[PDB]
Each structure stands twice: as structure tokens, then as C-alpha cells.
Write a protein that binds this ligand. Sequence first.
Ligand SMILES: Nc1ncnc2c1ncn2[C@@H]1O[C@H](CSCC[C@H](N)C(=O)O)[C@@H](O)[C@H]1O
Ligand SMILES: Nc1ncnc2c1ncn2[C@@H]1O[C@H](CSCC[C@H](N)C(=O)O)[C@@H](O)[C@H]1O
Ligand SMILES: Nc1ccc2ncccc2c1
Ligand SMILES: Nc1ccc2ncccc2c1
Lengths: 257, 268
Amino acid sequence: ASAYQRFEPRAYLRNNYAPPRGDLCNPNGVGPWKLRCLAQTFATGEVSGRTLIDIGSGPTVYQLLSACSHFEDITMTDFLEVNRQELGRWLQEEPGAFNWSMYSQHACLIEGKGECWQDKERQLRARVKRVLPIDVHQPQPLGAGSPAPLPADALVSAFCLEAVSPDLASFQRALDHITTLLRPGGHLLLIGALEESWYLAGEARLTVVPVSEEEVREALVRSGYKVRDLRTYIMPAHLQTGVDDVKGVFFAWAQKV
Amino acid sequence: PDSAPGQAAVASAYQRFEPRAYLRNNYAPPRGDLCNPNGVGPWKLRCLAQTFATGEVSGRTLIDIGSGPTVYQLLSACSHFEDITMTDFLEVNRQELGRWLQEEPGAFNWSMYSQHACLIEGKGECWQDKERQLRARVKRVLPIDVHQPQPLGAGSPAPLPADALVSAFCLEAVSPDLASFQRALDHITTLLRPGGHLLLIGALEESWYLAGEARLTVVPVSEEEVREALVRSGYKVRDLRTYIMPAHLQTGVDDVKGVFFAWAQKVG
Ligand SMILES: Nc1ncnc2c1ncn2[C@@H]1O[C@H](CSCC[C@H](N)C(=O)O)[C@@H](O)[C@H]1O
Ligand SMILES: Nc1ncnc2c1ncn2[C@@H]1O[C@H](CSCC[C@H](N)C(=O)O)[C@@H](O)[C@H]1O
Ligand SMILES: Nc1ccc2ncccc2c1
Ligand SMILES: Nc1ccc2ncccc2c1
């Protein structure tokens, strides 16, 4: 765990969200795939409500671009202060903010509603009410008197759980922990690395539990979800860059029962 | 009577035309605000996009008539033509384009327009790809004078005759009056092959617009005057639509009351 105290936000953003993995121009890349999964799911009109919490946001906002038009109250979270500050810099249009515009643009493209990317960002910035500390290893990840409206109508979490868990069972428990934040009948969108064991964030080398699609499925079932959808993206050779050993990416749409 | 005097006045007036001020006036916000779907920028792009989306306007060669310092008018066109000719009377506009072609930072930024075009064409094309393709398909930037019987001159570089023409806010902006406008339409029609297409966009009932120090005189035209001229020139009008300029978009940079878009096909 303590490895996360060397985690450099800018290095992680560079490693994953700048070219080559950050090139959205190629439709077969991982960036467009992730956005596509997010957009298609909300376009169904079945993931809706008032409040949403993003679990382990890190310094990234892309995972909420499509979500933001279905939820008026959004809570972003991370274990690290540096990440929350990086988020704050973008949410407040402060200096040095990461440029997410290509992603906003592509979400607008994919969604096909004719929306300009600036409106999309305006709405996202406006519906994120708070950026809060969080530790999924804790039975109450948000703590006791959290400002976050609970229970949430929906959850999003991308590349958090497996990346904070030494093994399957720890992964399963963290899942159990965040699931308590979710209202019954609510929805979870879970995104994560498949069969990954490490990734780099500057000086930080993080351990990851290698999970499979079937393991992810079973974990959700054991937690009280019906899996509405689970798709896999296989990482092409050209996006295997030395920043990690991720083999593929899973997308899960789960509904708490 | 005789065309020299007015054409002389026009040529004289454009010696003061400032591309940057014009770019700022029409293509930066508020008129350059692509977020409001009711705005004129989105309408113009939408007219182009929808027309090319029919699949009915295709071929090898396209000529843009009176390009000025702008490229937006070719964003949807560029996927349908291998060879694109851009053109203008003023060297300064041609250099402006040269600055965009070379992908210089000093160039005017059209990326909002590229993105919006990508957005409305609905193929999930990224804007850098659209731009890269426009830059590849523009084979030449030429001097042009629409008042000349041979607008491009004698033995021009352009592959003649073209399969399609585009022209935005040129003819009316350089014609002291209607007969001048008609003659200009007639002159550019000689560049188009029979059965070919002209996409014509322009200001309605405009008598002046500003380009820095230069204050240019425009012949005020109606939709019906536009239609008749096209018929008069040997076209069938396939589409003619009108945008009424919203009050909030009348900014003192001109007295334009509306914009027209004509899709016309040359009889032959
Ligand atoms: N014990 C813990 N509980 C909850 N989140 C944690 C955690 N330890 C580390 N994290 C956060 O988990 C994130 C993994 S990477 C950020 C993923 C981001 N959501 C995106 O989609 O790319 C990091 O931000 C990290 O700081
Ligand atoms: N005699 C002439 N023949 C052809 N084009 C001319 C001309 N005199 C001026 N022009 C060009 O007509 C343009 C009018 S402004 C329109 C520019 C651009 N097509 C747009 O859509 O914004 C200017 O670029 C001007 O220099
Ligand atoms: N460790 C990570 C985090 C995010 C990713 N997104 C796409 C592909 C691989 C990824 C690895
Ligand atoms: N003189 C001009 C040139 C371009 C325009 N585009 C939209 C509206 C008015 C316009 C006037």
C-alpha cells in the first residue's frame, strides 16, 4: 500500500492518457474503447438517478464525461491528496491543469448528440460538487460523516480496486466495501486492468492483483450484483509500452440486487 | 454599360482588407461560437455537411472561389475530392492560408471548426484526421478575379473544368451591383463542368462589412435575386435555404440581415 505515497500524478497521466495510449484518433485504441463502453451504457437510459460517486478517481476525469448528463450530484474521490489537488486544478480551470479536451471532444463525438466539448466540460465541472478522501480497504471507504449523499444511485470505478489489492480476496473485500455506498437496485460501472501485476507512476512501482474476466464476474456475483454486461478489450502490441504489464481491459456493468 | 469603374473601386477597397480583423469579426466568437446550434457558424457547417452527405456531390476536382483566409468551407468537402484548388484576389489572404497549410502556430486556429464538422458528419472522425486530409487534398492556392471572363487567367494551373465549385461570401462582397454579381456568377460557371455542382453561400441584403481599416461595399441581394441569377447562369437549383441573422449576432461588423445557401447543378 505504502507504495502509493510515491505516486506521481503527472507521470501516471503521461503514461496512460498521453500518446500513444492517449491518441483518440484511432478507433481501435484503448482510449476510444473505454469511452465507448461508458457512452453506450448511459445511452441505454437505464443508468440514472440523482447522485453518483466515482471510486478512486485519481487525477482523471474522462470516466465521468458521459456520466455527467445523467447525474446532477457527482462525488469524486481518491486516497491521495496529490490526486485530489490535480482534480481540483482541472475542475477549477486552474493553471497547470491537465488538458482533457480531446477526451471531451471524443465523448461528444461518440454520444452523437451534437454537443460541443466545452458544454460537456462545463456540465461536468458543474455537477462535481466535491472531491473527497477515500480508502476502499475501510468498511466505510468514505468514513463516518461524509459530505457525500448516501446511498448513491450509481457508482463508477476505473483501475482502482485491482490496483489497491494484493490478491483476489482483498479485491473481493474492497468491492464489498464500496458496494455499501451503493443503494439497492443501483448501478456500478467498473473498469480495470486484466491480468496486470504492476504499473509505474514515476518513482512509484505499484503492485496489482492479476484478475481475469471470469474472476471479475464471480467477484461481482459474490458481492450482490447481477452482471448486466461485461466486455473485454485486448491490449494491442503497440500500446504495450513499458509502463505496466496489463494484458487487457475489462468493462463491467453491474446492478446491485 | 461598362464594368471597369466599379471593379476598380472594389479592387481599391480590398487593398486595405485585413485578414486578421476579418477572421476575428466572423470566425471568432460570438459568430464563431460553435456551441449554440442556432448560431450561423453551425448552420453554415450544417448546410455543407448535409449536402455532401447526400453522396450526390462527388468527383475528382473542386475549386473554392474567393477562399479568403478561411478553410471551414472545405471541411466536409475534403472527403469527397482528391484535388482541391483554393483561390483569392489578395496575396495576404493566400499567405494566411499558406500559414495554415504549413501547420504554423501563427496560423489561425480552425480546430473548433474541424471538430464541429467531425461532430455533425457523424463518423467518429477525430479533428486532426480531418485537418490532415484537407491539408493533403489542397493542391494549390491561386490568385483569382471573378470579374475576368477567365477568373483564373489563361492557361491556369487548375484542372479545368472542375467537378464542383464552392464559394462563400465572395460574389456579393466584390460586386458593385447585381449585373456585376450576375456576370461574376457567369464567369465562375465557365470553370465548372456540365452536370457539376456549385455550393454557394453568402450574405443577404448586405451593403457593407468591415475588415479592419477597410470598409467594403456589398451589393444587397435577396434570395429571389440569388435564385434567378443561378437560373440565368444555366443551373438547376436543387436547394436554396435562408438563415435569418439573429439580433445578438449583428455586431456592427456589417449590416447582413441573413445568409443564403444554394446547392445548384450546372445544366448540361
Ligand atoms: N487504499 C485505497 N482506497 C481507495 N483508492 C486508492 C487506495 N490506494 C490508492 N488509490 C487510488 O487508486 C487509483 C488507481 S489509478 C487512478 C484510476 C483512475 N480512476 C482512472 O480511471 O485512470 C489512484 O488514484 C490511487 O491513488
Ligand atoms: N475581384 C475578385 N474576384 C474573386 N475574389 C475576390 C475579388 N476581390 C476580393 N475577393 C475576395 O473575396 C473575399 C470576400 S470574404 C469571404 C472569405 C471566405 N470565403 C469566407 O467564407 O469567410 C475576400 O477574401 C476577398 O479578397
Ligand atoms: N494501470 C492502468 C490504468 C489505466 C489503464 N487504461 C487503459 C489501459 C491500461 C491501463 C492501465
Ligand atoms: N461579410 C460576411 C462574411 C461572412 C459571414 N458569415 C456569416 C454571417 C455573416 C457574414 C458576413
